[PDB]
Structure formats: structure tokens, C-alpha cells
Amino acid sequence: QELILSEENKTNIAVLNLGTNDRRNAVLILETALHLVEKYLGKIINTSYLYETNYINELMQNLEESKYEENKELIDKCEEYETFLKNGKVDNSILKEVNVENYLLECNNIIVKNDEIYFYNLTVVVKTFVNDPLSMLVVIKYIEELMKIIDIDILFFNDFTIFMKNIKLEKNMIYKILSKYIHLEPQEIINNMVDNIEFLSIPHVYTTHRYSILLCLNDMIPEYKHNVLNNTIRCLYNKYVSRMKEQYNINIKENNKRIYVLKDRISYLKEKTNIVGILNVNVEPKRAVQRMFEMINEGASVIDIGGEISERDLVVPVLQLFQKEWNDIDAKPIISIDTINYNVFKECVDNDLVDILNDISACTNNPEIIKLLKKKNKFYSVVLMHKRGNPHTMDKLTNYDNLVYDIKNYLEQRLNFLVLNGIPRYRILFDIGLGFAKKHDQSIKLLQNIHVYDEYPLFIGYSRKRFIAHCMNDDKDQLLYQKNICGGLAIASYSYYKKVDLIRVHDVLETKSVLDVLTKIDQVKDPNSSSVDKLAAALE
Amino acid sequence: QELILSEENKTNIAVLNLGTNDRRNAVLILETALHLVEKYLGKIINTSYLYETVPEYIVLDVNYINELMQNLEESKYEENKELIDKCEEYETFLKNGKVDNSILKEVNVENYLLECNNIIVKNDEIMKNNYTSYFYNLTVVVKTFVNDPLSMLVVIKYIEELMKRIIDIDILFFNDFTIFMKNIKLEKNMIYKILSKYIHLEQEIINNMVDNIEFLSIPHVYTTHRYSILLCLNDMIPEYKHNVLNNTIRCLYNKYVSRMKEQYNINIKENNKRIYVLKDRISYLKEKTNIVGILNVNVEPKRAVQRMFEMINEGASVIDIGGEKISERDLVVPVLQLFQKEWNDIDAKPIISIDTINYNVFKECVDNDLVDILNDISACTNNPEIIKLLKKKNKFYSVVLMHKRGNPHTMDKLTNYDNLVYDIKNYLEQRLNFLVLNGIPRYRILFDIGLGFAKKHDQSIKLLQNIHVYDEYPLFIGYSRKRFIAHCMNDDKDQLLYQKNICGGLAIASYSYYKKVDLIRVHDVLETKSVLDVLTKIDQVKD
Ligand SMILES: Nc1ncnc2c1ncn2[C@@H]1O[C@H](COP(=O)(O)OP(=O)(O)OP(=O)(O)O)[C@@H](O)[C@H]1O
Ligand SMILES: Nc1nc2c(c(=O)[nH]1)N=C(CNc1ccc(S(=O)(=O)Nc3nccs3)cc1)CN2
Ligand SMILES: Nc1nc2c(c(=O)[nH]1)N=C(CNc1ccc(S(=O)(=O)Nc3nccs3)cc1)CN2
Ligand SMILES: Nc1nc2c(c(=O)[nH]1)N=C(CO)CN2
Ligand SMILES: [Ca+2]
Ligand SMILES: [Ca+2]
């Protein structure tokens, strides 16, 4: 009706899905999608992990402004989103609702019609100023077209149960949904659009049949229960998992891999133990850029730069000299800054000197540091670490109700907040903070129970810490320097077998040597040749 | 007249069970039993592992030893230390082949079963009518010159009396015989006559034995009923089938393990532990990765003994000494002789292993009490006479058996294997079989795959990937500083390949820890120790 161009200010919960098939640019593709789902729709307030199941560089400088103000203001809750998960009282739908049974038979048909005839998933939740799914779909297919590669779909829209059959509308009607939401200053797009929306389906039809979706939704909205679906998202997912194992004898989680992004590239969760080189500037900036290189060639994937004589005077020129002498000359080290200072990180990010924030307070010193993790086109990854106190009070701040789980819950909550504020889940790393307000037997216990982080990207730092020495039994300070490095290599081995994603180390060459040998031992050609060869010997 | 004393010189196969409760003295007690077996009864041609075993009373639910050794009477039968490579009588025993009739009356199966089953319930009642301490069990096969089971039991009881519970020795089988003799009364001068047939006798030991031999069962009443018995026999004679038994030993042992899981949710394995012996004491198989510190001696003895002490303090449990212009003997013996003196100027003592294939060198070390273990890289194929030096009258010595092909010059060429992992394992098994046939206790034998010895780098890698193949065996490996380590790395030259090899070795130390390798042989004792300490701490979940 005319109710579509209703000017009354409204807010809706817009759960989406963002697809691609290109492996090499899935990050550069889907983050570009998000920036425009953030520009032209509302606010991203949830993301799932990324899963496996040059034109764009120029476009971003010339974009059509939105008729809505962009808000980098941090929030700590969302009332509308909280209403959505519970499915309480919200406004009546703009477009006509088919009932529970009417939707079910219409769902079965569109499946069977297409049944007769790697995928890179990432779901979102958008706090949206859009009025209705079809108004959103018009903006979506317009976004799709400006990206020239991508399939953005609507998965829910509040608790709405809408199926709309035949849809075609005029070349000015489409423009009169684009005028409502976007400044328009070119027309080739509308031509492809007109019949590229044939239908509307809320919820999406594939939702409970495709695995790539029930896996993304399990991350974001596990307890959510639509009137359409037979159970909660968790329970439909956990049935699909045991169903594939029982019926077809397939571990489905084996081919559908969780991804985390450090900088530019895909990274498969639990599939590598990256070395992170410690560069501690505490002074001659020549010697330090020399050391960065020494560490790259020794095998470090990441360099963790930290100066905590001003902090920015210790870190920024050292990073500046690095960036000059690098271009002096796909092997480029990822750079993380060990700072809690907003001004230092801002300067580093605005001069493109860093890729990761390593925040040892888990962004609780200055929550506003979260803002800086996203420019107009770039996102940045973050290490969130657990601690209590400072270096002077730490050692005494040691009582926990439940050590392992309090720290885990702490970090999960911290993530939840970053996520609510549109930091993409797959860019958040967990760090238990070994030796930071932990006794030695407590640091060990955290390692004992490291499996607790099997679903998450894990960054840890054991190197040279006092707890290593506590493990050892019985020139005085020189022997203990040797034992500390060697004791560290034990923890690298442990980390390797526990599939820890990143380890933060001083002794890069030694750790690389250890990881190389362990990797070789695991590099088995024929996975069932041990039993084959066993059987051959028994038949003499 | 007794045809039990008949002068007809016979060769019988006997299977014995040995038991003690003394944890600390288990090795000394059981090996003393082994000597007296070897001395008074025949030739030891098989042994099981040593086991720490849970007591099975209910089925269906100090210094004098050494002084005794100085004061033994001569056997009337000779000791022959010559190497054997086969034994016919034993092959006949295992097959159940044609053997002379029993001098003692045999019962049939149904009678045996009735009588054996009877004895069990009686004993079962007396025990429920009634005790914590573990048993230390071992089985042995003796090619015996004793005429019959009853005469054998008489001699066994003499052995048990000489030793002065401390020791129990049972006969499990004697040839293919089935025997159940109730109410045995042997006259005290019959006992004397039997003992005097086999031993040059030189007081109320004989009087004590009169009421000690109450009955005779062959097979032993508890053969099928005690886990600890079947556990030991599974090691020696897994496919043996006595007429009175439902199946082979392996099947019987296996059924028992499975029945314990189904009918009881017991893992019968967890509390019945396999033991190996490096020198003196019990080690539990797979419970500790021991460090073996390398000393290459190849005008140096003082600096070498210094290094010995550096290694002990750095945490080595074992020192492996090797000297392979100047002779091997001259390199190693002074160093060992000096170590022994310095140590005597002061159970914190390291075990001493000598890396040698030379009879002459080993003979001198053993004579002068300088070593505990033979590390033989040829797996005693170079001079099998060296096996004779592993047994004294009272001492047994442990031995590392290593796989190699050729010599250091032809070695890197002899590299073709049909089934690498299993060829090597079978080779080591056969070498163990020969030593075991020749009287070396199974629990003193250590397996070593010989990394880098006639293996291309990938082959040394494949061997480590497949180390699980030795989960049943005492395992010794030496990876330290070998070329195959560097073959793993993705990229001064003098002190950088050096660093990487040391650092790569520590990765294998880690892998070895998780694979529960029993002994690792390393150059870098302190570095290796720090790894193992840390990995041990992470594992200590204890409260
Ligand atoms: N094959 C056999 N081996 C040893 N003893 C036997 C055998 N058959 C019968 N016996 C009798 O059983 C008696 C058991 O005495 P002994 O103290 O040696 O063992 P036990 O502890 O009583 O029981 P077990 O024979 O179950 O170990 C022996 O003195 C002997 O007379
Ligand atoms: N993400 C991340 N970033 C880090 C980390 C870390 O673990 N994770 N650790 C340090 C180093 N901090 C540290 C150093 C020594 C000890 S300690 O074990 O030696 N104990 C001390 N207690 C008091 C003062 S130092 C503890 C922590 C610096 N930055
Ligand atoms: N039980 C036992 N005893 C041993 C062992 C062993 O593995 N097990 N190894 C050596 C040392 N021999 C050896 C050394 C090096 C290589 S190598 O292939 O790696 N070559 C080189 N090593 C260093 C420089 S070049 C091979 C064998 C001596 N004694
Ligand atoms: N495990 C084990 N248990 C026993 C043994 C023995 O040798 N081993 N001997 C017994 C009576 O001689 C009673 N119980
Ligand atoms: Ca927005
Ligand atoms: Ca003999």
C-alpha cells in the first residue's frame, strides 16, 4: 500500500545472511557488504563466525549518502533486539501474513520445484530503520548491484510469517523506495532489478534445510524460537548434527569450517598454531626494525609491538621506520599493538601502521577503543585478554569462585559487547592472560583446561613468565634463563596439540623449530595405512 | 622300589609361576628364584614380563639372600651356557606332539575338571571365612631334567625353604600331562632320595616339606581362574592348548579381559601393571619418560667424569657411555673406573649403560662392576656370545636391542623395506625371542628402532609417526642431533643448525612424552629435563 512510504519513525530487527563463493577475497567482499548494510539499513548488533561450507577499492570514495545519521555511539543493551529474542508484543505487519499451516505447504513447493532442477556464510542482525522486508529487499538488491559475487538474503523480520507470490513493480516504484532511504544524485541498476525480486519469503524457505544457515544462526540466536520452526535454533542445529552422524554416518562439522580473520585473509579455526613475535621497545629505533625482520625470517606470522619517554614516541616512529624500509624491499607480517591507550591506537590506525589491537584490559580501560576498530571500509581484529589490577597488585588478586569458568564467562561477555556494537565476531580473539592475577598453580590449571576454548580463536602468552620456573624440580640467573626458554617450548608443544591458534613468544626461532618438527610428525600421507600395514604383517 | 628315581635321563618341558609380595625386593627375590631354577631344575627357555598384580584369593565373585648365594650345594647336572637357536622338546611341547608316557597316573578330563573344580570351592569358602599387599608375578618355561611333576615339586619346595609371603613357585604345566593326585604322603627319606638325585646334598627343611606337599594338580588348579596367571602365560605361550583347557592361552586371556568389562565394568588392565627392569628396581611400563644422557668419550677421564656428574645434576636417570689410534677399551674403562671411585667418595646413583658391541669391552666392565646395561646397536647379532655376559650366578643385566643394517659406510644405502614399520618390529621381536630362548628375562629387554641407522629421513619420520606399535614393549629411542630432524625445518651456519637441531629434538622429547616412550637418549640433558618437567606439571591434575 501507501503504508510502505510511511514517514513515522520505526525500528525493526533485520536478521540477514551474506554469501560468497570467491575464496581469495571473501573477507574483502563480505566486509564491504557489512559497511553498506551499516550505511543503508541501520545498525549491525550481531554477527556469526565466517564459515566455509581492485574495482571495490575505487567505489568506496564515491558513495551515495544515506537519509539517516550514522551513530558510532556505543550501546550496552538493545530493547528492540531483546523483544525480538523473546517474541513479545511488537507492531502489526505492513504486508499480509499467511498463517502457520499456509506457510508450511507453500514452503514445501518452492523446495521441491528447485529440488527437481565452497560456500562462505556470515549471518547478521540489523537494528533497522526500514519499514518492511520488501522495502529492505529493494535496498539489498540495490547494494548487491553496486558490488557488481554476493547473495544477501532476509532470514527473519521480527516474528512475521509472510509469503508473497508474484511480485513485479515499476521502474519508478523501485526508485520511490530508494528515495525514502537514500540521497540519489546511474540508472542501469534498476533495469536488472525489476524482475530480480520475483518473490518474498519471511522466514526464508531454506532456513531449516540448509546446514550453512542453522550453523550461522547457532552462533547468534541459539535460544530463538519462531512459530514456524518446530524448536529453538540450538535444538534444530543439534538434531541436524546427530542426524548426519546417525543416518548417513557423516561428521558434518568436518567440511564446514569456522574462520577467523587476523588481517586480510581467511584462517581456519584450530588448523594452525601461529607464532606471534614480541617486540618490546623498552632506545634505538634502528635496532628494533632490524629485530622485526630477524623475526619475520625466523618464522613469526604476527609481530606484537608494545611500549607498555612517551608511549607513542616509543611505538609510532618504530612502526613508521618499519613501513618505509618494508616498501624499500604475500609474506607481510601482521602487526598487533599491545596498547590500552586510545590516542596511540588511533594514530597507528590512521597512518595504517597496525592490523590488530592487543588490549590487555579486554577494552575495559577505555571501551571507546572499540570505535577505532572500524574505518569506512576497513575492519580491525582484537585480542581481548583477562586480568585483574595492574603489575603492582596482580599477584594478590587471586581468589576466583571458579577459575576456568569465571575467566571464560568474562571473555564471552566481553565478546558479546563488541558484537552488539558491530565488531564482527570472527575478528575477536580470546586470551586467558596467563600470570595476570593468577598464581602459578592457577596458570597451570588454565592450561589444563584450555579445551574450554575449542569453539573460539585463542591467543595465549606463556613466554618467560614466572609460572614456567615453578614447574621445574631440584650463573644462578643464567641457568634459569635457559630453563625458561626450554620450559616454554614444552608449552608450545602442548599448545600445538591443543590446537591453540596464536602463541606470543620471545624466542621465535626456537618455537618455529619445535612447531616444524611436530607438524612433520603429523603430516601422514595415507590416514589408514597404519591398519593396512598392520594387517599385511599378520598375513606374514 | 621306586621308578620315580629311574636312571633314564629325560628332557621334559615345565611351565612355572613365581610370586612374591615384597615390592622393594621383588627383583632380587624373583631373580634369585630364577637362579635356583636355572641351577637345580634345568634351562630357562622363556619368561614372561614381571607384573604388579591385584590379589586373587577369591575366584568366582634383607641380607641373607646374598649369604645363601655363597653357600649353595652343587647340582648333580651340568650347566651349559652355550647359545642355542632352537629347542625341539619345546617345539614339541607347544605343538602337543609325541612325548613319552607320564610315570605318574593321569586322570581324564572329566575327572580333572570334577577334582579341580572341587578344590576351588573348598578354598573359596576358607578365604571368604577370613591381605592388602600386591603380588609380584612372573612365569618361566624350563627345559627340565627332573623326571616328573612330583619330584619337581619336591625340589621346588627345597628352593622355597632355602630362600625361607617371600616366594611361591607353582608348576603350571608339565609336558601334556593331566594329573590329580590326592592325599600325598611322601616318606621323609623318599624326599631325601629325590633331592639327592638332583643335588649334591651337604636340617628340618626336609621335615618341614613332609606336610607341605598335600596334593598334586597338573595343570595347576588356578591356571584358568587367575588373571595374573593368564597375563603371564599370554606373554610366553599364547597359542598353547592343553587338553583340559577350553581354548588357547590368548583366547582365554582375551575372554577374561572382555568378560570383566561386560559383566563388571572393570578394566582389569589398570591395576595389573607390566614391569620392566633397568638395574635393580621396578619400573612400570609407560609411566615415565627417562632421560639417558649421552657421553661420547671418543687423556680425558677427569673431564668426562665431570660431565657425568653435570648430567646427573641436570637430571639424567641413565648415562650411556660409548667410545665408538686409541682402543675402545682404553677410552671407556678408565672413565668408568674413575666414575666409580668418585661416586664412592659421594639410590641417587645413575644407571650406567655402555654403548658397545665388543664382547671384550663388556666383559671387563661387568667383571669390575662398572656398568648396568648393554646398549648393543647390532641387537647382539655381531657377537651373540655377549649374551653369556648378561647372566652371572646371581646377577642379570638389562640390554638395549637396536635395529640397524650394515656399518656406518654401507648404512645410508641399505634402505629398502617392504613394510618399514613392521619389518623393524618383527626383527626386534625375533632378537628378543633368541635372547629369551637363551635365558635372558623378557622384562630386561629394551626395543630400539634405530632412528637414522639404515633409514632415509622420511623413514625415521615414518617410524616416529608409528611409534604406537611399541605400546606393549619397553622402548628406547635416540633422536638427538640426527640429520632427520633438520629435514623437518622449513628453512653463523656453525651455531644455527646446532640451535635448530637442539630445539627440534625437544619437540621429539614432547612427542615422546605423550607417546610414553620409556627411555630417550639425548645430548642435551638439562633442556630435555625442563621440557619433561613442564609437561609433567601440566598433567598433574591432582586436586
Ligand atoms: N601344580 C602344582 N604346583 C604347586 N603346588 C601344587 C600343585 N598341585 C598341587 N599343589 C599343592 O598345593 C599346595 C599349595 O601350597 P603353596 O603355599 O605352595 O601354594 P598356596 O599359596 O597354598 O596356593 P596356590 O597353589 O594356589 O599358590 C602345595 O604345597 C602342593 O602340595
Ligand atoms: N595478549 C597478551 N599480551 C601480553 C601478555 C599476554 O599474556 N597476552 N603478556 C605480557 C607480559 N606480562 C607478564 C609478564 C610477566 C609475568 S610474571 O609471571 O613474570 N609475573 C609478574 N608478577 C608481577 C609482575 S611480573 C606476568 C605477566 C604482555 N602482553
Ligand atoms: N640405542 C641407541 N644407541 C645409539 C644410537 C641410537 O639411536 N640408539 N645412536 C647413536 C649415534 N649414531 C648416529 C648418529 C647420527 C646419525 S645421523 O644419520 O643423523 N648423521 C649425523 N648426525 C650428526 C651429524 S651427521 C645416525 C646415527 C649411538 N648409539
Ligand atoms: N595376583 C596374585 N594373587 C594371588 C597369588 C599370586 O601369585 N598372584 N597367589 C596366591 C596364593 O599363593 C593368592 N593370590
Ligand atoms: Ca548505521
Ligand atoms: Ca641350568
Ligand SMILES: [Mg+2]
Ligand atoms: Mg537469494
Ligand SMILES: [Mg+2]
Ligand atoms: Mg601363587
Ligand SMILES: [Mg+2]
Ligand atoms: Mg603355590
